Ligand binder design. Structure first.
Ligand SMILES: NCCc1ccc(Cl)c(Cl)c1
Ligand SMILES: NCCc1ccc(Cl)c(Cl)c1
Ligand SMILES: NCCc1ccc(Cl)c(Cl)c1
Ligand SMILES: NCCc1ccc(Cl)c(Cl)c1
Ligand SMILES: NCCc1ccc(Cl)c(Cl)c1
Ligand SMILES: NCCc1ccc(Cl)c(Cl)c1
Length: 322
């Protein structure tokens, strides 16, 4: 069987908290009043959600309303409990209310309003915003929660106010050491190698891999950086950059049973130098410190990646106010 693993940090946060903190199935959800709100306009949609700008008619404040198709009720309870536990954390979206349609029983989450800013980014801007995301991740990991869906669309930035919010906690989960989790999390391009090789005993370090994918796409102007066309191909795209030598050493370290399908597609690939991705169009965003930081996030071995707190101490952030 596979070798067990434990987070290097915040290992026992949930172990030392009462069950009311992490037992989301027992959480008593209390509805607010859907009549306090009026929908203004549709902002976007997902397979099981619709997002609207709305106004709270009792105080004239704008809000964002996420209407959920309740296909998996336990999942909605988990998102609500996590949002309540994390409320007030640095750069964590604030859940303002929870309402239900009086006839269809469709639930809706009400968030603080955020004016999302859709080439003008400087090296300094990337360092600044990357540090704000790290504050959010160090906070949620310190609270015993893995986000598990870190990606650009889940990072809202109001650039005029230099305001950042980490959103969509629908895939977030409580970290319990030794627990085996579902690997069918995160968006394809941001999935860590642990998910792709079906290593279930993962932890907060998954979010640090996803953060590394975002950094690579920003500094190299290549969106997404690892462009897989399915979950198997996703690992091949990673292997084409990090090389196959370090991938095979990772699988052996954790005694992972690698799917036989990888034999026909993985091949043999050299370790590429991060400098290979630098071009005239992206050189203004790359520096030795940026590449050193990227190299310390994008590691196959989940235990070897920087933690959010270690990442915050990297020289890449020496130019930002802590
Ligand atoms: N009447 C169903 C649509 C809907 C959903 C959520 C809210 Cl908060 C509102 Cl006002 C309206
Ligand atoms: N996973 C949420 C993606 C997302 C982000 C921002 C907006 Cl405004 C919308 Cl509609 C949807
Ligand atoms: N939706 C904003 C995505 C994003 C994520 C990280 C950074 Cl550093 C930036 Cl500039 C932008
Ligand atoms: N996707 C769930 C979280 C979420 C989605 C979109 C927006 Cl605009 C906000 Cl505030 C929050
Ligand atoms: N400091 C970024 C510009 C630059 C110049 C030369 C090289 Cl080889 C690289 Cl990777 C990057
Ligand atoms: N990575 C391809 C070679 C290369 C390396 C560094 C720079 Cl700055 C350029 Cl333009 C081109």
């Amino acid at each position: 069987g596979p070798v067990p693993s434990r987070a290097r940090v915040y290992t026992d946060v949930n172990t030392h908290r009462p069950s009311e903190y992490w037992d989301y199935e027992s959480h008593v959800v209390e509805w607010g009043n859907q009549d306090d709100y009026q929908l203004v306009r549709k902002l976007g949609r997902g397979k099981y959600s619709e997002v609207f700008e709305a106004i709270n008619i009792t105080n004239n404040e704008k809000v964002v309303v996420k209407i959920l198709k309740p296909v998996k009720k336990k999942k909605i309870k988990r998102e609500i409990k996590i949002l309540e536990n994390l409320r007030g954390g640095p750069n964590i979206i604030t859940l303002a209310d929870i309402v239900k349609d009086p006839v269809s029983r469709t639930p809706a989450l009400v968030f603080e309003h955020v004016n999302n800013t859709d080439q003008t980014l400087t090296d300094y801007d990337i360092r600044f915003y990357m540090y704000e995301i790290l504050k959010a991740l160090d906070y949620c990991h310190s609270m015993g929660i893995m986000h598990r869906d870190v990606k650009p669309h889940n990072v809202m930035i109001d650039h005029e106010h230099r305001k950042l919010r980490l959103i969509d906690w629908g895939l977030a989960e409580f970290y319990h050491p030794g627990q085996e989790y579902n690997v069918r999390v995160a968006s394809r391009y941001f999935k860590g190698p642990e998910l792709l090789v079906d290593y279930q005993m993962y932890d907060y370090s998954l979010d640090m891999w996803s953060l590394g994918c975002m950094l690579a796409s920003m500094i190299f102007r290549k969106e997404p950086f690892f462009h897989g066309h399915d979950n198997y191909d996703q690992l091949v795209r990673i292997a084409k950059v990090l090389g196959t030598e370090d991938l095979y050493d990772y699988i052996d370290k954790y005694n992972i049973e690698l799917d036989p399908r990888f034999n026909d597609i993985l091949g043999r690939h050299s370790r590429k130098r991060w400098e290979r991705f630098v071009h005239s169009e992206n050189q203004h965003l790359v520096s030795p410190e940026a590449l050193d930081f990227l190299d310390k996030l994008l590691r196959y071995d989940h235990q070897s990646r920087l933690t959010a707190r270690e990442a915050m101490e990297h020289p890449y952030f020496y130019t930002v106010v802590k």
